[PDB]
Structures are given as structure tokens and as C-alpha cells.
Design a protein around this ligand. Structure first.
Ligand SMILES: [Zn+2]
Ligand SMILES: [Zn+2]
Ligand SMILES: [Zn+2]
Ligand SMILES: [Zn+2]
Ligand SMILES: [Zn+2]
Length: 115
């Protein structure tokens, strides 16, 4: 299995660890972790280039967002591998093109490195 981690650090209190595992080179990439020091509600969860959308993560009342995701779009290998890209949790929600009418500041960010 191929594995990676992102350690999200921000300017303010936002921080957290994100794991990625992919059993087959074309199968889904499992994504998990928690992120702390967020405002309650949805927060844009992207993979930049330095965008790819992993949707949003959801923070609870005291700022903690547990992330458990399975994504068959992202991959850790191949021409569009996310290793060496930067994982980003944003200030506002990604409305995913359904805002009723982009995702605010980057609050905390982390490079997706092989583990
Ligand atoms: Zn392995
Ligand atoms: Zn973004
Ligand atoms: Zn909590
Ligand atoms: Zn290509
Ligand atoms: Zn929108």
C-alpha cells in the first residue's frame, strides 16, 4: 500500500494531521485525520499545486473536524499524483458550485509527503 501524511499548520490555531492510503494504484485513496482550532461548520478542503477538491470538512462546536473520506479521483501515483502537492483547509466552505448564486483564506496548509 502507498501511504502519505500532511501536517497542517496555520498562522492561528488551525492544525492537524492527515493520512492517505491507497491499496491499488487505481483504487480509492482513503483519507483520515482530525483538524483542530476551526470555526464551527464546513471548511473547504483542497489539494493545491504550489486546485483539487476533497469537498469540505466539518468542524464541531469546539473546533474539531474528524475527516474520513474515500476519493477515487485523487491518486498518490501516476501522472497526477498528489505527493508533493499541498493540502489546504480553507476559511469558508467550498460550495461545490451550489452556492445558490472562492473558499476564503487558506487557514492551514501541509505538503503531502510519502510515509
Ligand atoms: Zn505498502
Ligand atoms: Zn483551495
Ligand atoms: Zn469536539
Ligand atoms: Zn495528465
Ligand atoms: Zn459558489
Amino acid at each position: 500500500a502507498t501511504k502519505a501524511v500532511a501536517v497542517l499548520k496555520g498562522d492561528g490555531p488551525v492544525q492537524g494531521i492527515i493520512n492517505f492510503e491507497q491499496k491499488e494504484s487505481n483504487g480509492p485513496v482513503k483519507v483520515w485525520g482530525s483538524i483542530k482550532g476551526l470555526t464551527e461548520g464546513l471548511h473547504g478542503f483542497h489539494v493545491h499545486e504550489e486546485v483539487g477538491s476533497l469537498g469540505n470538512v466539518t468542524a464541531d462546536k469546539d473546533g474539531v473536524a474528524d475527516v474520513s473520506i474515500e476519493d477515487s479521483v485523487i491518486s498518490l501515483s501516476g501522472d497526477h499524483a498528489i505527493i508533493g502537492r499541498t493540502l489546504v483547509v480553507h476559511e469558508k466552505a467550498d460550495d461545490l458550485g451550489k452556492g445558490g448564486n472562492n473558499a476564503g483564506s487558506r487557514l492551514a496548509c501541509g505538503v503531502i509527503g510519502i510515509a
